[PDB]
Structure 1
Amino acid sequence: PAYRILKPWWDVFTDYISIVMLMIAVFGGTLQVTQDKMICLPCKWVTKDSCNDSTGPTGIKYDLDRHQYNYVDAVCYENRLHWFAKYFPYLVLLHTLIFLACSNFWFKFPRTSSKLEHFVSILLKCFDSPWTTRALSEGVLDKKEGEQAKALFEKVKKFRTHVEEGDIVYRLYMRQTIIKVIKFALIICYTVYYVHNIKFDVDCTVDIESLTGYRTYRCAHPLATLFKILASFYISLVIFYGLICMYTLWWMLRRSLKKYSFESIREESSYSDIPDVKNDFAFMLHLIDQYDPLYSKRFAVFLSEVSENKLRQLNLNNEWTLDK
């Protein structure tokens, strides 16, 4: 719909980063489901559960069947591959889903969603109102435009009485931003600390001697360096998702967003009776200013009693014409 004006640049950037991280999750999950395996070769000479590592060259004969090799691979994939290298894509998918839910929670939570829909609808209809152009231009008026302007003025008064008492939208946005940086810190810590465990060479000691004949095996995890790449790329994106989110926190704490002053608008435009608004009205007008400040300007004329008096006088000139 038309919620694009309610999403500043930081929200758009975080949404696109979430899309790329979802692409990472899907790609890694497909690879982990389809082609993730280990190629384990037994160590012929062992030195206290450690490989001893010791006329032409001829191949070492291990006497294992293909299914014994498969059993060794499965056991050393389950028991000795690190949990990060196995469940990295699913952890990424979980983190992306939580990030998306946090970013889009207030669009689904009924109390905040109703207020946001009301605000966006009245602001779109106000910005598209011809009375805004007529008033900012400062008697010709179309009749339907006449009671349209009057009804929209009354609707603006209704909305101010209906939204301004509460701050649920601001508090919810604050909590979403706080969670989206706490989770970023936890993700960065546990992902940087455990990314080094995605290795290509894995030495496994699984004690399946009664079924295979060997205790220690040397295994190759083929999809590891790629998992070392994706994770690194993921650690890049999350870092961006952190920094942007941190800026949002700064944007929500550098000044009080529960108070909006129309001082510039009544400084420029004639209607100096335009008051200052508080709470969710103030925060949502700040969000609108993050998209296009002009959207605020054309709204401000609808918040003024002088404009109400002018509209009433001109409408009264119109419908009560001189002939009747």
Structure 2
Amino acid sequence: PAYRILKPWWDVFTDYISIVMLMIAVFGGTLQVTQDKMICLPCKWVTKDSCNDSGPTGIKYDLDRHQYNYVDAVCYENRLHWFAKYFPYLVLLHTLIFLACSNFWFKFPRTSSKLEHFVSILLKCFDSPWTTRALSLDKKEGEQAKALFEKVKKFRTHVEEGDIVYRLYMRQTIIKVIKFALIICYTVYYVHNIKFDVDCTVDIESLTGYRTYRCAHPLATLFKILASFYISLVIFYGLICMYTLWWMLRRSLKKYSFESIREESSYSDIPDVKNDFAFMLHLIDQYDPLYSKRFAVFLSEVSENKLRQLNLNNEW
């Protein structure tokens, strides 16, 4: 909606990567709930801890259906690695954390109120014909422009005094990048445990009769492919967050200069805003500099003097 101007290309890319990873998490969870089982068979020949490998006729184990189900359940609980069992749940949790970190400044009221007021004022100044005439009137248009000038002046002394939005965005970026580091450590380290064939020694010999069973995980290769895709998406997300952090730390975003705008335009008296005003104007520049150049009219004193002259002209 109206907040699309506050999301640069990195924000949109992170949002879409989070959407794709959320779909991956939902699909993996649906597979885990329904299809994830572990077909296990006992090994009659045992020569070590693992299962030993040694007309033709079938091998009879004399095990019931429920003995097989019990072996499957116990070797699923005990000797199947936790990462293969709870892979999509961790992905879902990480996507929820990423979405929370992306929408925290939009949902936290202290910064949400400032952001929505800034967006409303920027959109009201962008559609005002006084900006077009100044870059190049009716008495009602003149008094509306004067009221908007006063509203901008009240807004500037209210938001520039604090830097809560910049601090919150910096903390969100830091949390996102350290979350990416932790994910790309632990998920990559534990991705080798999703294997098709797993041997179990779960010690249920008193119930079934056999000691060691050789199992098979039907969803092992599909979960491994989903884990590789999730690792690639996490790598892309982390590179995007690294670019965002480098952009934030390269130049001070708490100090905005209108030097290019005041050089292009006739007005050379535009003041330098700071703190949250500077950060939001930097975000607008990363979206589109037209909004910033149109908003720079309401900060210059020369435009205010011209508006006062026009108001005096149309008053009498």
TM-score normalised to the size of structure 1? 0.96
Question: What is the distance in 2 between the residues matched to 1:49 and 1:58?
Answer: 27
RMSD over equivalenced CA pairs, Å? 0.8
Shift of 1:252: 0.3
Question: What is the distance in 2 between the residues matched to 1:119 and 1:232?
Answer: 41
| 1:1-324 → structure 2 map (5 Å cutoff) | 1-54=1-54, 56-137=55-136, 141-320=137-316
Question: What is the distance in 2 between the residues matched to 1:160 and 1:52?
Answer: 77
Divergent runs of 4+, >4 A: none
Do 1:170 and 1:279's aligned partners in 2 also have CA atoms closer than 8 Å? yes
Q: Specify the SS of the correspondent of 2:105.
A: coil
CA deviations on 1:62-118 (whole Å, 9 max, x unpaired) are: 000111000000000000110000000000000000000001100011111111011
Question: What is the distance in 2 between the residues matched to 1:57 and 1:145?
Answer: 96
**Which runs of 5 or more structure 1 residues have no equivalent in the other structure?**
none
Do 1:188 and 1:238's aligned partners in 2 also have CA atoms closer than 8 Å? yes
Do 1:258 and 1:278's aligned partners in 2 also have CA atoms closer than 8 Å? yes
CA deviations on 1:192-244 (whole Å, 9 max, x unpaired) are: 10000000000000111111010100000010000000000000000000000
Shift of 1:303: 0.3
Shift of 1:272: 1.0
Question: What is the distance in 2 between the residues matched to 1:12 and 1:68?
Answer: 52
Question: What is the distance in 1 between the residues matched to 2:171 and 2:60?
Answer: 62
Shift of 1:48: 4.5
Question: What is the distance in 2 between the residues matched to 1:59 and 1:128?
Answer: 81
Shift of 1:43: 0.3
Q: Specify the SS of the correspondent of 1:273.
A: coil
Do 1:84 and 1:197's aligned partners in 2 also have CA atoms closer than 8 Å? yes
Q: Specify the SS of the correspondent of 1:45.
A: coil
Question: What is the distance in 1 between the residues matched to 2:263 and 2:227?
Answer: 52
Shift of 1:51: 2.7
Q: Which moved more, 1:41-50 or 1:206-215?
A: 41-50
Cα pair distance change 1:115/1:34, threshold 3 Å = same
Do 1:177 and 1:249's aligned partners in 2 also have CA atoms closer than 8 Å? yes
CA deviations on 1:146-166 (whole Å, 9 max, x unpaired) are: 111111111110110110000
CA deviations on 1:257-302 (whole Å, 9 max, x unpaired) are: 0000001111011111111111100000000000110110100010
TM-score normalised to the size of structure 2? 0.99
Question: What is the distance in 1 between the residues matched to 2:292 and 2:125?
Answer: 10
Do 1:262 and 1:276's aligned partners in 2 also have CA atoms closer than 8 Å? yes
Q: Specify the SS of the correspondent of 1:210.
A: coil
Q: Which moved more, 1:79-88 or 1:263-272?
A: 263-272
Q: Specify the SS of the correspondent of 1:41.
A: strand
Shift of 1:49: 4.1
Question: What is the distance in 2 between the residues matched to 1:53 and 1:184?
Answer: 42
Do 1:199 and 1:225's aligned partners in 2 also have CA atoms closer than 8 Å? yes
Question: What is the distance in 2 between the residues matched to 1:50 and 1:222?
Answer: 20
Question: What is the distance in 2 between the residues matched to 1:52 and 1:128?
Answer: 78
Q: Specify the SS of the correspondent of 2:23.
A: helix
Q: Specify the SS of the correspondent of 2:280.
A: helix
Do 1:49 and 1:215's aligned partners in 2 also have CA atoms closer than 8 Å? no
Q: Specify the SS of the correspondent of 1:106.
A: helix
